[PDB]
């Protein structure tokens, strides 16, 4: 049902944690999803950008979606990231994700092998009939800005739930004034996006760390002092490209093992020490996990290319 | 041997033609490669952006490399596009591409899931030991400009042959002043890149149509009137994102079937009528194949999602 | 939980039905599983021999397991056939099947590339720790009889639920006298296996057609007149190798489309006419579906090699 | 060309050696192939039963074929084992194997999911049009004896080169009396098959160890004393199912690493000490490689499941 996707305000693009040889750590993963549920997260993107969907083989990506649905699907909406720059891969991944019971699909436009606007419509029309879909526009990553006129055309399909928008609040505004549901994809804009530009909520990286605070920010009104308390954390999280920050942070909080699939590599020690300061400034009680935050040594990290 | 790669001036990023069910049309592909050889192309990229490597599965990609090596490897350099945004997939694809006998690899930086400069170094160092490599910088497609300082760090690796650069002639000049071999990735700049800015040559889209003229442009001295006669054809080929133009043109020339793997769709008839006029203005004798060029109807083109 | 697998008496190796181009027909499949549930089937093997697991790619096999768990897993035990002649494929398929929530795994011994008894133990020990497992011995198909001493050793693992045994009642007896749970894999022996040789029940092909009668046979005592009423049907079902009969029968009853993935091909018209007679002799009210049984013409069947 | 296949008398089903992580050891593989060439082997089967095609993924299988073609295809016939119990996989694998340049295909009848004789015809006819083919009958592994009448139906297809027959010399004689080319698949029968029953030659396991002697056995006339000197080595190689023996022997000769992909495990030390004694009795100068033969300890062998 599309309405139940359009109602969600806090959707976590959840991190995918790894065992020391690079396989998925399902125990760590299930603990992360439980913590999100317990703090009032309402949806999860499985294998999004933050979840390193880009480094999974399809078999592990589908498995992670079916696993999430099977263990948690009665307590949180499960949105599979089954988009691709290849229409073939997007069709197969999407019908398989819905077949295993996911509630919605996140679809990016084709990245790297960008196409024409007419190719864009054709790509999205190949999958939009399969179930509730969120379209993801992030031109800083894909190389291509999905134009509003393509979204207005696609939003004729009742399966289109809305758009995860990264271009900025002026774009959010153009959609929401025209009746298209939008989730901000920029944590550091999502407060204003919510309260001033009609965004329904956020598809967040930062809620991997402080889900209770992100939920407060999306449900309890303007609170620019809470927003600006979170801004240093968000800036830290994006000092290098996502998910490098979140991968480093979750290892420091002891909820994830310090294992990276290449090409990502941890933030250096000076940044890690900054994170230890942010956690003390904001308060450890707001962060996921129970263990004391650690700086970690460089020697603690495992980088794997053959996963 | 890296020196043999360094010496190529004309490398064609060859188009991959399809059968109406979406599979590779190997007979048409062989004809295209033969045609390149008879016109003096010195290298092909197999499954590059132009060859839609992005739409292939790894098994069909490695197969096309091994097929290209087995049929043509004594007459042209075969450069497999075995890069990936995933280090795991880049390591596997590169190992297998070298095992079936390709002479070099083309490696892009990770697109879409972009990484830090440190991660980029880890990524390239995971494959550079395998054999002669060209690094590919096209930030308009990947979302990330590879900084010269990263290349300079890698360039003393004896396997780094040089860089396929799309940023422009000022970046070309910075690399060649610093002693890095550069191929221009922009057909509409490669003349000047070659004669004014020290590029060794071009990795070309336009040579799929006019290989003899592109060879002339890279070997015979500055020729600004040849260059400006090709410029309108070059603009036509990039009207929509490559390979939309080349896929359309080759179908009109009758050397490939009018079959598109999604998300690409053809140029519309008004552009296809311009292409007919360009062939006549430049001379059909310079274009690949021998069939009379056709305009084609929109209903000639088969758009396939489930390949 | 292993006990809940050991309790099941009627497990249907369910047929996998296809669309006209060879993809899975999930609508037809869901109707078959619903009919099994409604007639008191207690488990299903997903992608067994009968379900043509051997012709699926892994992605579709895992998908079918996760689909079955998600739609039906609260009303019937879902047993994935995640065995393989390759230990690698068996490990991956099995952990993925359990991750998507299947209740048990069916594991055959390595077929075609048969191994030593010591290789057999090693193969099974690679997967037995993952969850409740039924080991499948069918030497007429694999080329190798799993010996009782390998099963006695493996049955030290609390995850071993029991054995699907095809060698015959004397083998069933040897296991059941020693405390190992057995399901007969031979429909035409399963009555005697149940009542005289201690089998817990049957993993049945014939219950795809007459699930209510197979359930009666397994729960309601010796009834050799019911058994011998079913024998002509069972003999028909195995006139050619399974699943050729069941695929032809379900198409005749109108619950499946008449589409075969090669190398299977339908029974000829004279056999189909015999099936029409068996259905009238036993009574259409005992067979799955509501449509009148049809002979079908040869022209109605679709055989597909490129699925 | 089919006539060139028909003329080969000594074809080695080459072993695939592994690195300790489970990947192919291509350097050792090249040495083994070179050694076959220097001793007069005329064809190799790549990824046959002996080469563990059954444990490979299709991409590594097609890669090994293309690698074998690219490095050795001018000096030996390369016959890809591209058969499968799945017609879909046999069609794809065969197309790709021919595309990377193999000279012929080896096709087994569908094993485990066995089909009717009509289905078997449909299966073989789906791949026979692709190029020169040897059909492989080994009912002790597949569960199904291909009947001569099926081969006779297919043998007027100009692509059928002939049959690799494991049933025995009486079946060999029936085929050769009927004008079908036959290679013996049983090392311990191939002498008599060759000199008494009209076989053209052998597709051999034992030539992985003693290629020069096996060539002698097939080319130089009846030699019953050479034959009976090889018989004890041949018995040793089939003590457990092939390729357990050959994998053990090559490791002891030091031409491959002591690495096994599961489900195969090595022969125990008492057999490995017999192999040392056989090398000495026959003469090390006849065996592949030049390292002194070693017994090896059980703890030398790496058994890998997650390759
Ligand atoms: N690396 C590829 C494959 C990912 C497949 C699983 N999501 C991509 O980013 O498109
Ligand atoms: N569509 C994926 C996979 C391509 C794999 C073959 N080159 C990508 O662009 O990364
Ligand atoms: N045809 C192969 C692959 C099947 C994979 C899905 N069960 C086999 O029978 O082993
Ligand atoms: N294990 C499967 C797949 C092998 C695929 C590569 N030859 C089989 O024996 O059919
Ligand atoms: Na608002
Ligand atoms: Na807390
Ligand atoms: Na906490
Ligand atoms: Na010409
Ligand atoms: Na021409
Ligand atoms: Na009993
Ligand atoms: Na009924
Ligand atoms: Na019924
Ligand atoms: Na020697
Ligand atoms: Na030797």
Q: DSSP assignment, residue B78?
A: E
Number of other CB atoms surrounding residue D3 within 10 Å:
10
Cis omega (within 30 of 0) on the bond before C263?
yes
* Contact indicator for C260, C303 with CB cutoff of 8 Å: yes
Q: Which helix (H) or strand (E) holds B36?
A: helix B26-38
Beta strands (DSSP E) in chain C are 10-13, 43-46, 77-80, 104-108, 133-137, 160-165, 182-184, 201-204, 259-261, 302-304
Alpha carbons within 13 A on the beta-carbon side of B31 = 14
Which residue's CA is minimally distant from atom 9 of ligand 2? B54
Number of other CB atoms surrounding residue D11 within 10 Å:
29
Number of other CB atoms surrounding residue A39 within 10 Å:
18
* Contact indicator for A102, A65 with CB cutoff of 8 Å: yes
Whole-angstrom distance, CA of residue D4 vs CA of residue D17: 28
Residue C53 CB–ligand 3 contact under 6 Å:
yes
* Contact indicator for B295, B269 with CB cutoff of 8 Å: yes
* Contact indicator for A136, A120 with CB cutoff of 8 Å: no
Q: Could you tell me the residue range of the domain that residue C297 belongs to?
A: 1-307
Atom index in ligand 1 nearest the CA of residue B84 equals: 1
Strand, coil or helix: D261? strand
Q: Which helix (H) or strand (E) holds C174?
A: helix C169-177
Closest to D135 measured CA to CA, from D116, D115, D109: D109
C interface with D, Cβ–Cβ below 8 Å? 49, 52, 54-55, 85-88, 91-92, 108, 110-116, 118-120, 122-123, 126, 140-143, 240-241, 244, 261-265, 303, 305-307
Closest to D96 measured CA to CA, from B35, B70, B28: B70
* Contact indicator for D247, D259 with CB cutoff of 8 Å: no
Closest to D171 measured CA to CA, from D134, D202, D199: D199
Q: What is the resolution of this structure in A?
A: 2.2
Active site residue B170: no
Atom index in ligand 3 nearest the CA of residue C82 equals: 7
Closest to C303 measured CA to CA, from D116, A95, B24: D116
Chains in contact with C via at least 3 Cβ–Cβ pairs below 8 Å: A, D
Q: Judge: A119–B261 Cβ closer than 8 Å, yes or no.
A: no
Q: What is the CATH classification number for the domain harbouring B250?
A: 3.20.20.70
Whole-angstrom distance, CA of residue A262 vs CA of residue A259: 10
* Contact indicator for C248, C272 with CB cutoff of 8 Å: yes
Whole-angstrom distance, CA of residue D75 vs CA of residue A161: 61
Closest to B62 measured CA to CA, from B78, B38, B74: B78
Closest to C17 measured CA to CA, from C293, C255, C264, C294: C255
Which residue's CA is minimally distant from atom 8 of ligand 2? B54
Domain count, chain D: 1
Q: Is the dihedral of CA D30, D190, D247, C129 positive or negative?
A: positive
Alpha carbons within 13 A on the beta-carbon side of B244 = 23
A interface with C, Cβ–Cβ below 8 Å? 26, 58-60, 62-64, 66-67, 69-71, 73, 92, 96, 99-101
How many angstroms does the Cα of residue D10 sit away from the middle of ligand 4? 25
- Could you say which of D26, D71, D100 has the minimum Cβ distance to residue B67? D100
Cis omega (within 30 of 0) on the bond before D70?
no
Residue D54 CB–ligand 3 contact under 6 Å:
no
Q: What are phi and psi of C11, to 5 degrees?
A: -120, 120
Q: What are phi and psi of D106, to 5 degrees?
A: -105, 125
Residue C164 CB–ligand 3 contact under 6 Å:
no
B interface with A, Cβ–Cβ below 8 Å? 22, 49, 52, 54-55, 85-88, 91, 108, 110-116, 118-120, 122-123, 126, 140-143, 240-241, 244, 261-265, 303, 305-307
Q: Judge: D305–C88 Cβ closer than 8 Å, yes or no.
A: yes
Q: Which residues of D touch C91 (CB under 8 A)?
A: 305-306
Give the 3-state DSSP-derived string for D76-100, with helices as H, strands as E and coil as C.
CEEEEECCCCCHHHHHHHHHHHHHC
The technique by which this structure was obtained is: X-ray
Q: Is the dihedral of CA C114, C115, C121, C122 positive or negative?
A: negative
Q: Judge: A100–C67 Cβ closer than 8 Å, yes or no.
A: yes
How many angstroms does the Cα of residue D254 sit away from the middle of ligand 13? 14
Angle between helices D269-282 and D224-237 (to 10 degrees): 160
Residue A85 CB–ligand 2 contact under 6 Å:
yes
Closest CA in chain B for residue D97: B63
- Could you say which of C92, C126, C307 has the minimum Cβ distance to residue D262? C126
Q: Judge: A99–C62 Cβ closer than 8 Å, yes or no.
A: no
Which ligand has the minimum distance to the alpha carbon of residue B287?
9
B127-158 CB burial, b ≥16 within 10 A, e <16? bbebbbbbbbbbbebbbbebebebbeebbeee
Closest to A113 measured CA to CA, from B260, B29, B22, B134: B260
B46-71 CB burial, b ≥16 within 10 A, e <16? bbbbbbbbbbbebbbbbbbbbbbbbb
Closest to A251 measured CA to CA, from A268, A239, A266: A266
Q: What are phi and psi of A45, to 5 degrees?
A: -90, 130
Active site residue A114: no
* Contact indicator for A7, A43 with CB cutoff of 8 Å: no
Identified catalytic residue from B15, B77, B164, B216: B164
Between the alpha carbon of residue C19 and those of residues B137, B304, C301, D307, the distances in Å are 44, 18, 12, 35
Give the pairing type, strands B160-165 and D10-13.
Answer: unpaired
Alpha carbons within 13 A on the beta-carbon side of A68 = 34
Q: Which residues of C touch D262 (CB under 8 A)?
A: 87-88, 119, 122-123, 126
Chains in contact with D via at least 3 Cβ–Cβ pairs below 8 Å: B, C
């Amino acid at each position: 049902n599309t309405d139940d996707i359009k109602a969600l305000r806090v959707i976590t693009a959840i991190k995918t944690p790894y065992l020391p040889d690079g396989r998925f750590d399902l125990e760590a993963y299930d603990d992360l999803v439980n913590i999100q549920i317990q703090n009032g997260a309402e949806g999860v993107i499985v294998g999004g950008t933050t979840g390193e969907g880009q480094l999974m083989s399809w078999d592990e990506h589908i498995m992670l979606i079916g696993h999430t649905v099977n263990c948690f699907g009665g307590s949180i909406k499960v949105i599979g990231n089954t988009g691709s720059n290849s229409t073939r891969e997007a069709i197969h991944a999407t019908e398989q994700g819905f077949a295993v019971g996911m509630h919605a699909a996140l679809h990016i436009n084709p990245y790297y092998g960008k196409t024409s606007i007419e190719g864009l419509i054709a790509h999205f029309q190949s999958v939009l009939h399969m179930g509730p879909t969120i379209i993801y526009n992030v031109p800083g990553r894909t190389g291509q800005d999905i134009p509003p006129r393509a979204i207005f055309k696609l939003s004729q399909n009742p399966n289109l739930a809305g758009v995860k928008e990264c271009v900025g609040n002026k774009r959010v505004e153009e959609y929401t004034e025209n009746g298209v549901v939008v989730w901000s994809g920029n944590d550091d804009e999502c407060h204003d996006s919510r309260w001033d530009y009609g965004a329904t909520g956020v598809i967040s990286v930062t809620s991997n760390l402080v889900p209770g605070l992100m939920r407060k920010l999306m449900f309890e009104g303007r609170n620019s002092s809470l927003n600006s308390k979170l801004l240093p954390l968000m800036a830290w999280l994006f000092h290098e490209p996502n998910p490098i920050g979140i991968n480093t942070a979750l290892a420091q909080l002891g909820v994830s093992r310090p294992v990276f699939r290449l090409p990502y590599v941890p933030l250096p020690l000076s940044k890690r020490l900054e994170f230890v300061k942010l956690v003390k400034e904001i308060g450890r009680e707001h962060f996921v996990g129970e263990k004391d935050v650690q700086a970690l040594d460089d020697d603690d990290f495992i980088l794997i290319g053959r996963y």
